[PDB]
Amino acid sequence: FVNQHLCGSHLVEALYLVCGERGFFYTPK
Amino acid sequence: GIVEQCCTSICSLYQLENYCG
Numbered sequence: 001f002v003n004q005h006l007c008g009s010h011l012v013e014a015l016y017l018v019c020g021e022r023g024f025f026y027t028p029k
Numbered sequence: 030g031i032v033e034q035c036c037t038s039i040c041s042l043y044q045l046e047n048y049c050g
Contacts, residue, residue, distance in 0.1 A: 002045055007036040014035075018042065019049035026048070029030040 006014050015024040034044045 002040055002042045004039060005036060006040045007032075011031065011035055011040070014040070015045055015048060018045045023050035024048050025050065027030055028032045 002014055002018065012026055015026060018024075031044070031048055034040065
């Protein structure tokens with residue numbers, strides 16, 4: 001599911017699923 | 030940043046994991 005254009009909430013959802021308990025940082029700049 | 034690599038271009042697992050904690 002990660003090899004596509006991921007924008008907005010879809011990108012944050014992908015980070016949430018991939019990173020799991022590691023957490024993540026979202027910096028759109 | 031992540032938007033340029035994953036939204037305006039096609040994302041990858043490597044790129045997403047760059048931003049995990």
